[PDB]
Design a protein around this motif. Structure first.
Motif, PDB file in Angstrom:
ATOM      1  N   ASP A 132       0.828  -1.207   0.000  1.00 61.11           N
ATOM      2  CA  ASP A 132       0.000   0.000   0.000  1.00 61.11           C
ATOM      3  C   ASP A 132       0.872   1.271   0.000  1.00 61.11           C
ATOM      4  OD1 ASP A 132      -2.345   1.600   0.020  1.00 61.11           O
ATOM      5  OD2 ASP A 132      -2.797   1.221   2.141  1.00 61.11           O
ATOM      6  N   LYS A 134       1.948   4.747  -1.315  1.00 62.54           N
ATOM      7  CA  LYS A 134       1.372   5.943  -1.938  1.00 62.54           C
ATOM      8  C   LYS A 134       1.830   7.201  -1.170  1.00 62.54           C
ATOM      9  CE  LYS A 134      -3.045   5.055   0.462  1.00 62.54           C
ATOM     10  NZ  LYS A 134      -4.459   4.644   0.259  1.00 62.54           N
ATOM     11  N   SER A 169      -4.910   1.472  -3.107  1.00 62.76           N
ATOM     12  CA  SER A 169      -5.636   2.302  -4.044  1.00 62.76           C
ATOM     13  C   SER A 169      -5.422   1.822  -5.453  1.00 62.76           C
ATOM     14  CB  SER A 169      -5.174   3.743  -3.918  1.00 62.76           C
ATOM     15  OG  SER A 169      -5.134   4.117  -2.556  1.00 62.76           O
ATOM     16  N   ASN A 171      -5.097   3.439  -8.213  1.00 63.30           N
ATOM     17  CA  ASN A 171      -4.126   4.294  -8.908  1.00 63.30           C
ATOM     18  C   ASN A 171      -2.669   3.871  -8.650  1.00 63.30           C
ATOM     19  OD1 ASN A 171      -6.557   6.273  -7.808  1.00 63.30           O
ATOM     20  ND2 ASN A 171      -6.004   6.782  -9.914  1.00 63.30           N
ATOM     21  N   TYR A 172      -2.421   3.151  -7.536  1.00 67.59           N
ATOM     22  CA  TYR A 172      -1.094   2.691  -7.117  1.00 67.59           C
ATOM     23  C   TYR A 172      -0.911   1.172  -7.235  1.00 67.59           C
ATOM     24  CZ  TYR A 172      -1.098   7.475  -5.320  1.00 67.59           C
ATOM     25  OH  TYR A 172      -1.199   8.840  -5.202  1.00 67.59           O
ATOM     26  N   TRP A 191       6.062  -1.044  -8.690  1.00 65.96           N
ATOM     27  CA  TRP A 191       5.010  -0.379  -9.467  1.00 65.96           C
ATOM     28  C   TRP A 191       4.486   0.826  -8.684  1.00 65.96           C
ATOM     29  CZ3 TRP A 191       2.899  -1.348 -14.383  1.00 65.96           C
ATOM     30  CH2 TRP A 191       1.741  -0.623 -14.693  1.00 65.96           C
ATOM     31  N   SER A 192       4.163   0.622  -7.385  1.00 67.45           N
ATOM     32  CA  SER A 192       3.680   1.651  -6.464  1.00 67.45           C
ATOM     33  C   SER A 192       4.704   2.781  -6.338  1.00 67.45           C
ATOM     34  CB  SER A 192       3.381   1.047  -5.096  1.00 67.45           C
ATOM     35  OG  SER A 192       2.392   0.035  -5.186  1.00 67.45           O
ATOM     36  N   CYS A 193       6.006   2.428  -6.221  1.00 62.54           N
ATOM     37  CA  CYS A 193       7.123   3.375  -6.147  1.00 62.54           C
ATOM     38  C   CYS A 193       7.267   4.160  -7.452  1.00 62.54           C
ATOM     39  CB  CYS A 193       8.420   2.660  -5.781  1.00 62.54           C
ATOM     40  SG  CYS A 193       8.556   2.217  -4.032  1.00 62.54           S
ATOM     41  N   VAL A 195       4.728   4.954  -9.480  1.00 61.21           N
ATOM     42  CA  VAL A 195       3.610   5.905  -9.483  1.00 61.21           C
ATOM     43  C   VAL A 195       3.979   7.122  -8.611  1.00 61.21           C
ATOM     44  CG1 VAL A 195       1.102   6.245  -9.203  1.00 61.21           C
ATOM     45  CG2 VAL A 195       1.961   4.011  -9.907  1.00 61.21           C
ATOM     46  N   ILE A 196       4.589   6.881  -7.420  1.00 58.02           N
ATOM     47  CA  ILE A 196       5.047   7.918  -6.476  1.00 58.02           C
ATOM     48  C   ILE A 196       6.099   8.819  -7.153  1.00 58.02           C
ATOM     49  CG2 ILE A 196       6.168   8.383  -4.203  1.00 58.02           C
ATOM     50  CD1 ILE A 196       4.904   5.449  -3.414  1.00 58.02           C
ATOM     51  N   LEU A 205      -1.142  11.818 -11.585  1.00 56.13           N
ATOM     52  CA  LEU A 205      -1.036  10.357 -11.632  1.00 56.13           C
ATOM     53  C   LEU A 205      -0.834   9.864 -13.073  1.00 56.13           C
ATOM     54  CD1 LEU A 205      -3.960   9.558  -9.146  1.00 56.13           C
ATOM     55  CD2 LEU A 205      -1.550   9.313  -8.597  1.00 56.13           C
TER      56      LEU A 205
END
Ligand SMILES: N#Cc1c(O)c2c(-c3ccc(-c4ccccc4O)cc3)csc2[nH]c1=O
Ligand SMILES: O=P(O)(O)c1ccc(-c2cc(O)on2)o1
Ligand SMILES: O=P(O)(O)c1ccc(-c2cc(O)on2)o1
Lengths: 442, 185, 302
Positions: A132, A134, A169, A171-172, A191-193, A195-196, A205
């Motif tokens: 998680d 974000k 989320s 989006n992340y 992948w989450s990193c 997006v950040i 985003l």
């Protein structure tokens, strides 16, 4: 007088609400020291059946010692609630900082990403995946340092195991997360990193839409606009980090090798770096010294924090550190990359388990028939997942094995074989149990 | 040992009266809908009740005890396990367990017909360590660092010359051994 | 004395420290045919493999190129007839002929010191030592003289160098200098295999018509007969058996008597070769120095 107090701290305004429980500011009644108190209601945990999830979360945070992960000082227990006294950071959310400035400048965005990835790598090395990540879950202090917080959706990494849960989320979340497919899960954090990193530099985003299925279609497609203000170096890093195929997706080693990430990177954030071994404590080495010298962990630390480096306990710790460095530097000696002399002697391709074109129900019946012939005894935990056992006649020990059916394609199916670990040979016992079922099934 | 007394219900003024304070009204601090007070209490049975807007009441979600004259008051059992976190989580897990050894009986496929599809094969398992080309320079016994997800999984070759070849990667302490077994069928 | 510092190093370090992070191990069942097992050593790129007895449920021994050398010399008749025993016999059947001397399984624990591993290899006159975990019973890695010397070469800067390391090879006299078994350039493979069985040596230097050493025919060069499928023609010369691999071979590598022990160790580690040909000032052959002779001097005797 009537102040709500827990462990000398007066509970104040609500900072926010996470995955499990509420987070409030805690001010010390005598000094004025600020802490973040996460309140976990015992009945709510019992109702949601998350007793195990909370148990692992506390265990990990008690073990975790990283300057970019929220530190857990103590956890006060009451007959109805759990009070997690955590490290407080004044700056708040990274999400709020991005919105305030519009776009985070390259000098700061690189610095923040390096601090985030340092914390993510620490989690992965300790077999823990955040799931998680974000800017809402990434916090900032007075000195503008990144700190990851919500470990509610986090899970453990086990050998030959996969995580199925869908978390965080949309989006992340990675394309495999939204699709409900199995994953190793280190890749999901990348992948989450990714997006950040895009959110820091662009202030928007890379995958954003009002309609949920349209948003999901954008993530699965893996197509995102790269603005003109971003250089070709960071653009290639974002593309490699945001790959639909988890196999083609970047790893921490790939990000560490990238020229953009290498720039002004401190030598203490990641292991094997120049100033890491002299400034960052190694948990595995301290325990090794404690059993050799028959002393407590605090005494080993006192010898390291002392004025003289020639102190008895300090030299023993660094001997393990030095020996580890020599072995880690010689990568060609421990791992594979004029020809080699042994290669002067030297193809059939290998495949996972048994492949079948037959109906999934028909494959099950063949396995139950084969086991009976071999006298195997099994536990039917799932329709396609079994836990088989066989007693060896020579050694006099049980051989545990895990059977799992997978879908390769629209017409293909695969039967997976996995060894379970609690004179002979454990590995040979697994192969012989596999050979017995393969011959009987075919 | 701290004890939490939270009033989830509504009201403007809420007081706490219990056996611990000789049945006297204690004013609770309000944030939003929450009226709470953390009191240091020893281990044992404690009876208490709430005084909301000038009237006596109790929390319906909490266990209750009724006296001879018919006055309802919540009862709290302060246990030794409630003081420590891991001791409390061990008790909480026991209450969580609600409604099977080894057998030779096959599973019924599903209630009715499940029509259940097997989970989609992860691409990580298709990454065969023995297929991967290491290159000439290194020793042939050397292999790249395997993913934790492919460990303990069986990989085999097609049966040729009446001999079956099986392989799996297993971990000794921080090391991984990829054993190969040539066993005739 | 600054000596025995390498001996103390082997006593302090475990066998676990040498095992690679990710390695390949090939194991053969006793019921498997010899022909298929020797081809499996080629395809996988291994020189030895532990033997697993399915009935006894325990590791019995090791299958090396020496077994293939012994099978060829004992059963070869002609290039016209096929070697029946190599084609049909199992490892179990071969062990009932070769080891009938019922040799026990010579192995070491991963937690055991390197001093014991070096001792076990020299004492038993073996070159392949399997590392078996007593907890699980699984074979982890196959220890060799090359792996030990390469590991020691990483810690040479961490410990003070003794007086003998600075001393010359002529002063120390490490290696064999007398009774050197050699083969001519025209000698057939069958004769060369016979000297490997009788004298029990690992390598044979190849001599030219003029008298100069042209190459070295070692025990490892025999698996090329199984690789190229040229095993039934042992009448061909040593030169004819080495020419196909002669391009990336680099067998003969020399060391001078005046050269220090340190430079010889660095040469054996870098080239990854098992032995160096000892030469004089006039570039004339004096003897042979191997990895076993080197580790016998550093670890054993003090
Ligand atoms: N979520 C929510 C929640 C709580 O707020 C508390 C509280 C709590 C409630 C309000 C206050 C409070 C009261 C007055 C002023 C400020 C406060 O933070 C302090 C603690 C004690 S246990 C508990 N358990 C919960 O599940
Ligand atoms: O005695 P062994 O352990 O059976 C043996 C087999 C092969 C070798 C060998 C190969 C080589 O180039 O030097 N020695 O030694
Ligand atoms: O008998 P030696 O010539 O002294 C010797 C030294 C090193 C080896 C050797 C052979 C081998 O497959 O691994 N190590 O054999």
């Amino acid at each position: 007088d009537g102040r709500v107090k827990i462990g000398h701290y007066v509970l104040g305004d609500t900072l926010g609400v996470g995955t499990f429980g509420k987070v409030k500011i805690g001010e010390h009644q005598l000094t004025g020291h600020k802490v973040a108190v996460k309140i976990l209601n015992r009945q709510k945990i019992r109702s949601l059946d998350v007793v195990g999830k909370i148990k692992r979360e506390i265990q990990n945070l008690k073990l975790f010692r990283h300057p970019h992960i929220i530190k857990l000082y103590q956890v006060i227990s009451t007959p109805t609630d759990f009070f997690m006294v955590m490290e407080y950071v004044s700056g708040g959310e990274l999400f709020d900082y991005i919105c305030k400035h519009g776009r985070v400048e390259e000098m700061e965005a690189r610095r923040l990403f390096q601090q985030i990835l340092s914390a993510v790598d620490y989690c992965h090395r300790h077999m823990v995946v955040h799931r998680d990540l974000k800017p809402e879950n990434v916090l900032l202090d007075a000195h503008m340092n990144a700190k990851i917080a919500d470990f509610g959706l986090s899970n453990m990494m086990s050998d030959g195991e996969f995580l199925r849960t869908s978390c965080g989320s949309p989006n992340y979340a990675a394309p495999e997360v939204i699709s409900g497919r199995l994953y190793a899960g280190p890749e999901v954090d990348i992948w989450s990193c990714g997006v950040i990193l895009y959110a820091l530099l662009c202030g928007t985003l890379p995958f954003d839409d009002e309609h949920v299925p349209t948003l999901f279609k954008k993530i699965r497609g893996g197509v995102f606009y790269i603005p003109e203000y971003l250089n070709r170096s960071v653009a290639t890093l974002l593309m490699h980090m945001l790959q639909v195929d988890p196999l083609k997706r970047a790893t921490i080693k790939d990000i560490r090798e990238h020229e953009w990430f290498k720039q002004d990177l401190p030598s203490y954030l990641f292991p094997e770096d120049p100033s890491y071994d002299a400034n960052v404590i190694d948990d595995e080495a301290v325990k090794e010294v404690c059993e050799k010298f028959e002393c407590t962990e605090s005494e080993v630390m006192n010898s390291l924090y002392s004025g003289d480096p020639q102190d008895q306990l300090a030299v023993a710790y660094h001997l393990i550190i030095d020996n580890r460095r020599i072995m880690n530097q010689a990568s060609e000696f421990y791992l594979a990359s004029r020809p080699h002399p042994e290669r002067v002697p030297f193809k059939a391709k290998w495949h996972l388990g048994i492949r079948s074109q037959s109906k999934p129900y028909d494959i099950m019946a063949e396995v139950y028939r084969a086991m009976k012939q071999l006298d195997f005894e099994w536990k039917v935990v799932n329709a396609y997942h079994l836990r088989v056992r066989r007693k060896n006649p020579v050694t006099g020990n049980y051989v545990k094995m895990s059977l799992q059916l997978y879908l390769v394609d629209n017409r293909s199916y695969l039967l997976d074989f996995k060894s379970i670990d609690d004179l002979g040979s454990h590995t040979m016992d697994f192969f012989e149990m596999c050979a017995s079922l393969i011959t009987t099934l075919a | 040992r701290p004890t939490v007394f939270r009033w989830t219900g509504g009201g403007k003024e809420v007081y706490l009266s219990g056996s611990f304070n000789n049945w006297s009204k204690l004013p609770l601090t309000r944030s939003h809908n929450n009226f709470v007070a953390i009191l240091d209490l020893p281990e044992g049975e404690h009876q208490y009740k709430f005084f909301v807007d000038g009237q006596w009441t109790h929390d319906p979600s909490e266990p209750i005890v009724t006296s001879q004259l018919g006055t309802v008051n919540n009862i709290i059992q302060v246990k030794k396990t409630d003081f420590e976190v891991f001791d409390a989580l061990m008790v909480d897990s026991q209450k969580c367990s609600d409604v099977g050894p080894y057998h030779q009986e096959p599973y019924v496929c599903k209630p009715e017909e499940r029509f259940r599809a097997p989970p989609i094969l992860p691409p990580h398992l298709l990454q065969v360590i023995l297929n991967k080309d290491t290159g000439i320079s290194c020793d042939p016994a050397l292999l790249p660092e395997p993913n934790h997800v492919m460990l303990n999984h069986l990989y085999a070759l097609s049966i040729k010359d009446g001999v079956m070849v099986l392989s799996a990667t297993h971990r000794y302490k921080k090391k991984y051994v990829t054993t190969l077994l040539y066993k005739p069928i | 004395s600054n000596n025995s510092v390498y001996t103390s190093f082997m006593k302090s370090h475990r066998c676990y420290d040498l095992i690679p992070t990710s390695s390949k191990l090939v194991v053969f069942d006793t019921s498997l045919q010899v022909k298929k097992a020797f081809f499996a050593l080629v395809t996988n790129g291994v020189r030895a493999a532990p033997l697993w007895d399915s009935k006894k449920q325990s590791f019995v021994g090791m299958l090396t190129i020496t077994d293939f050398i012994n099978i060829l010399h004992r059963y070869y008749k002609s290039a016209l007839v096929q070697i029946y025993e190599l084609e049909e016999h199992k490892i179990e059947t071969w062990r009932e002929v070769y080891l009938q001397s019922f040799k026990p399984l010579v192995c070491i624990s991963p937690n055991a010191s390197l001093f014991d591993a070096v001792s076990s290899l020299i004492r038993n006159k073996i070159h392949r030592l399997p590392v078996i975990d007593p907890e699980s019973g699984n074979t982890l890695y196959i220890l060799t003289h090359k792996r030990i010397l390469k590991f020691l070469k990483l810690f040479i800067t961490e410990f003070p160098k003794p007086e003998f390391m600075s001393k010359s090879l002529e002063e120390l006299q490490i290696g064999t200098y007398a009774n050197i078994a050699m083969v001519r350039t025209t000698t057939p493979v069958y004769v060369a295999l016979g000297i490997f069985v009788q004298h029990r040596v690992s390598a044979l230097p190849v001599v030219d018509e003029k008298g100069r050493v042209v190459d070295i025919y070692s025990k490892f060069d025999v698996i090329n007969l199984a690789a190229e499928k040229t095993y039934n023609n042992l009448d061909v010369s040593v030169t004819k058996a080495l020419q196909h691999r002669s391009h990336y071979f680099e067998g003969v590598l020399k060391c001078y008597l005046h050269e220090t022990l340190e430079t010889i160790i660095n040469r054996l580690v870098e080239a990854e070769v098992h032995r160096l040909v000892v030469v004089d000032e006039n570039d004339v052959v004096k003897g042979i120095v191997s990895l076993s002779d080197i580790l016998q001097a550093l670890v054993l005797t003090g």
